[PDB]
Scaffold this active site. Structure first.
Site, PDB file in Angstrom:
ATOM      1  N   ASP A  57      -1.632   0.000  43.210  1.00 17.30           N
ATOM      2  CA  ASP A  57      -3.130  -0.630  42.951  1.00 17.30           C
ATOM      3  C   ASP A  57      -3.993  -0.148  44.139  1.00 17.30           C
ATOM      4  OD1 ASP A  57      -4.709  -2.986  42.755  1.00 17.30           O
ATOM      5  OD2 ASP A  57      -3.122  -4.219  42.000  1.00 17.30           O
ATOM      6  N   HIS A  59      -7.985  -5.981  45.305  1.00 16.58           N
ATOM      7  CA  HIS A  59      -7.312  -6.348  44.387  1.00 16.58           C
ATOM      8  C   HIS A  59      -5.699  -6.143  44.891  1.00 16.58           C
ATOM      9  CE1 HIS A  59      -5.688  -5.755  40.140  1.00 16.58           C
ATOM     10  NE2 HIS A  59      -6.601  -6.494  39.929  1.00 16.58           N
ATOM     11  N   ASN A 103      -6.816  -7.778  30.181  1.00 21.09           N
ATOM     12  CA  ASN A 103      -7.656  -8.899  30.567  1.00 21.09           C
ATOM     13  C   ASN A 103      -8.741  -8.924  29.382  1.00 21.09           C
ATOM     14  OD1 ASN A 103      -6.509  -9.849  32.755  1.00 21.09           O
ATOM     15  ND2 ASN A 103      -7.754  -8.462  34.031  1.00 21.09           N
ATOM     16  N   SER A 136      -3.642  -9.207  36.293  1.00 24.37           N
ATOM     17  CA  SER A 136      -3.203  -8.697  37.680  1.00 24.37           C
ATOM     18  C   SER A 136      -2.518  -9.760  38.362  1.00 24.37           C
ATOM     19  CB  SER A 136      -4.626  -8.338  38.387  1.00 24.37           C
ATOM     20  OG  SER A 136      -4.731  -7.093  37.730  1.00 24.37           O
TER      21      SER A 136
END
Ligand SMILES: *C[C@@](*)(O)[C@H](Cc1ccccc1)NC(=O)[C@@H]1CCCN1C(=O)[C@H](C)NC(=O)OCc1ccccc1
Ligand SMILES: [Ca+2]
Ligand code: NA
Length: 274
Positions: A32, A63, A154, A220
């Protein structure tokens, strides 16, 4: 005092932790935007950065630090609690602080985990198109015995359209969709036949740089509940193969509906870890 986010009891991770299985000895790589190691509720033991100029133990996006806290925020008297608090956490930084990464960074981050013998890798990231090199990297990680988990995307649904991103869409990668605390599929959760399991992805409270906490929504946030569930399973049955861990999670999931929309349903780690 420590807050237990609703996703922990929702997937029955608390029951498994009470049996004494908390992910010890399992090496989890978070692929990430990095992990802010500075966070008091996280312990990062190693990693690699494939983003020039940024090291892996910093996170200027947030994130990766948020995703990391859902797998492994420490069980102590502060912050939140992860699904598998005792895992050995690795920060594999492949996205820069604006959230942009290259296919080549991503492939190197996966190869790094494969070469370093990690047990589980979580990729809360994706794109509309894959690549041969990205496909070969995930297939080699899974074939080498790594549980590979990714956020489905998403993008919601668009009629009949499959909106699963890559690398989640690859068969060697578990594609995870998002539900809220009432088990409703989130409106933004991607759909498609590769959708495999669901996990909490709406208003998930977790760690955030530099040393704070915040609620985020996303597939996520769902993915890390599944990578943490895989680590709890391996801490209880250490010698299981990647495909045995993968089948335990989907075969025991609680059916929520049409699999194009919910895959096999909501993971249940107590059942999966039986
Ligand atoms: C936060 C989280 O919910 C999403 C999960 C997601 C989003 C899109 C598709 C699949 C999964 N993760 C992100 O938004 C992360 C965090 C910051 C930026 N980011 C991305 O995933 C960016 C949008 N994608 C990335 O650069 O993918 C590059 C890529 C190239 C080739 C193949 C795959 C991915
Ligand atoms: Ca804590
Ligand atoms: Na898949």
């Amino acid at each position: 005092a420590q807050t237990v986010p609703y996703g922990i009891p929702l997937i029955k991770a608390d029951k498994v932790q009470a049996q004494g299985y908390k992910g010890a000895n399992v090496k989890v790589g978070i692929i990430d935007t990095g992990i802010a190691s500075s966070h008091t509720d996280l312990k990062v033991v190693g990693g690699a950065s494939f983003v020039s100029g940024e090291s892996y133990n910093t996170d200027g996006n947030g994130h990766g630090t948020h995703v990391a806290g859902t797998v492994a925020a420490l069980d102590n008297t502060t912050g939140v609690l992860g699904v598998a608090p005792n895992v050995s956490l690795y920060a594999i930084k492949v996205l820069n602080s604006s959230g942009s990464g290259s296919y080549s960074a991503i492939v190197s981050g996966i190869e790094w985990a494969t070469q370093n013998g990690l047990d589980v890798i979580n990729m809360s990231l994706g794109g509309p198109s894959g690549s041969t090199a990205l496909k070969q990297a995930v297939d080699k990680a899974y074939a080498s015995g790594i549980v590979v988990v990714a956020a489905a995307g998403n993008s919601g649904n668009s009629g009949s359209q499959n909106t699963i991103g890559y690398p989640a869409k690859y068969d060697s990668v578990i594609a995870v969709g998002a539900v809220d605390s009432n088990k409703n599929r989130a409106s933004f959760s991607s759909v498609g036949s590769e959708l495999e399991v669901m996990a909490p992805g709406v208003s998930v409270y977790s760690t955030y740089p530099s040393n704070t906490y915040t609620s985020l929504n996303g597939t996520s946030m769902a993915s890390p509940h599944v990578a943490g569930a895989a680590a709890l399973i391996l801490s209880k049955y250490p010698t299981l193969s990647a495909s045995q861990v993968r089948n335990r999670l989907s075969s025991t999931a609680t059916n929520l509906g049409d699999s194009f929309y919910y895959g096999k349903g909501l993971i249940n780690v107590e059942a999966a870890a039986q």
